[PDB]
From Swiss-Prot, chain A:
Heterotetramer; the NMDAR subunits are modular and harbor tiered domains that function in concert to regulate opening and closing of the cation-selective ion channel pore. Forms heterotetrameric channels composed of two GluN1/zeta subunits (GRIN1), and two identical GluN2/epsilon subunits (GRIN2A, GRIN2B, GRIN2C or GRIN2D) or GluN3 subunits (GRIN3A or GRIN3B) (in vitro). Does not form functional channels by itself. Glycine binds at residue 27. It comes from the Eukaryota. This is Glutamate receptor ionotropic, NMDA 1. It is found in: Cell membrane; Postsynaptic cell membrane; Postsynaptic density membrane; Synaptic cell membrane. Component of N-methyl-D-aspartate (NMDA) receptors (NMDARs) that function as heterotetrameric, ligand-gated cation channels with high calcium permeability and voltage-dependent block by Mg(2+). NMDARs participate in synaptic plasticity. Channel activation requires binding of the neurotransmitter L-glutamate to the GluN2 subunit, glycine binding to the GluN1 subunit, plus membrane depolarization to eliminate channel inhibition by Mg(2+). NMDARs mediate simultaneously the potasium efflux and the influx of calcium and sodium. A hydrophobic region that gives rise to the prediction of a transmembrane span does not cross the membrane, but is part of a discontinuously helical region that dips into the membrane and is probably part of the pore and of the selectivity filter. Belongs to the glutamate-gated ion channel (TC 1.A.10.1) family. NR1/GRIN1 subfamily.
Swiss-Prot record, chain B:
The gene is grin1. This is Glutamate receptor ionotropic, NMDA 1. Glycans are attached at residues 12, 32. Belongs to the glutamate-gated ion channel (TC 1.A.10.1) family. NR1/GRIN1 subfamily. Component of N-methyl-D-aspartate (NMDA) receptors (NMDARs) that function as heterotetrameric, ligand-gated cation channels with high calcium permeability and voltage-dependent block by Mg(2+). NMDARs participate in synaptic plasticity. Channel activation requires binding of the neurotransmitter L-glutamate to the GluN2 subunit, glycine binding to the GluN1 subunit, plus membrane depolarization to eliminate channel inhibition by Mg(2+). NMDARs mediate simultaneously the potasium efflux and the influx of calcium and sodium. It is found in: Cell membrane; Postsynaptic cell membrane; Postsynaptic density membrane; Synaptic cell membrane. It comes from Xenopus laevis (African clawed frog). Heterotetramer; the NMDAR subunits are modular and harbor tiered domains that function in concert to regulate opening and closing of the cation-selective ion channel pore. Forms heterotetrameric channels composed of two GluN1/zeta subunits (GRIN1), and two identical GluN2/epsilon subunits (GRIN2A, GRIN2B, GRIN2C or GRIN2D) or GluN3 subunits (GRIN3A or GRIN3B) (in vitro). Does not form functional channels by itself.
From Swiss-Prot, chain C:
It is found in: Cell membrane; Postsynaptic cell membrane. Belongs to the glutamate-gated ion channel (TC 1.A.10.1) family. NR2B/GRIN2B subfamily. Detected in oocytes. Component of N-methyl-D-aspartate (NMDA) receptors (NMDARs) that function as heterotetrameric, ligand-gated cation channels with high calcium permeability and voltage-dependent block by Mg(2+). Channel activation requires binding of the neurotransmitter L-glutamate to the GluN2 subunit, glycine binding to the GluN1 subunit, plus membrane depolarization to eliminate channel inhibition by Mg(2+). NMDARs mediate simultaneously the potasium efflux and the influx of calcium and sodium. A hydrophobic region that gives rise to the prediction of a transmembrane span does not cross the membrane, but is part of a discontinuously helical region that dips into the membrane and is probably part of the pore and of the selectivity filter. The extracellular N-terminal domain (ATD/NTD) endows NMDARs with a unique capacity for allosteric modulation, harboring several binding sites for small molecule ligands that act as subunit-specific allosteric modulators of ion channel activity. It comes from the Eukaryota. Heterotetramer. Forms heterotetrameric channels composed of two GluN1/zeta subunits (GRIN1), and two identical GluN2/epsilon subunits (GRIN2A, GRIN2B, GRIN2C or GRIN2D) or GluN3 subunits (GRIN3A or GRIN3B) (in vitro). In vivo, the subunit composition may depend on the expression levels of the different subunits. This is Glutamate receptor ionotropic, NMDA 2B.
Length: 48, 49, 51
């Protein structure tokens, strides 16, 4: 399916079609902003 | 709320409850100051007394 | 203090993978005999050092 787990091509590569996001200024935000691996995901979420 | 009420039942302490002002859980940041950073949110409410 | 706190301030909000391994303060108010400067500086690892 669309999400095969925490690690998925749709999740790993933020296509313009599939938009994933989270709540800014929260523990999730701190968690994604903490790791450099998740920095791409943070760049994808930051706008949405 | 039920957990807090049950805690107030087990432990004799009463409770005054209120919602946080910013509406966020907690974070550490400084808007206008590069020198020092401060907590905001319920965490900030806890550290501010 | 302003320098260190500034580097840490800017590096705090950086989304980049920034890492600073050590901050070493050498005391020049006293003459170097025990070679505490030597001992403190030899422990250094990182490729870039802000002096």
């Amino acid at each position: 399916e669309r999400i095969t787990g925490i690690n998925d091509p749709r999740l790993r590569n933020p296509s313009d079609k599939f938009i994933y996001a989270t709540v800014k200024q929260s523990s999730v935000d701190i968690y994604f902003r903490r790791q450099v691996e998740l920095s791409t995901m943070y760049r994808h979420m930051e706008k949405h | 709320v039920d957990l807090l009420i049950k805690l107030a039942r087990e432990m004799d302490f009463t409770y005054e409850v209120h919602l946080v002002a910013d509406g966020k859980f907690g974070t550490q940041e400084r808007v206008n100051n590069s020198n020092a950073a401060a907590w905001n949110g319920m965490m900030g409410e806890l550290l501010s007394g | 203090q302003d320098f260190e706190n500034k580097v840490r301030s800017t590096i705090e909000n950086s989304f980049v993978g920034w890492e600073l391994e050590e901050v070493i303060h050498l005391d020049m108010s006293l003459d170097d005999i025990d070679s505490k400067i030597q001992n403190q500086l030899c422990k250094l690892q990182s490729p870039v050092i802000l002096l």
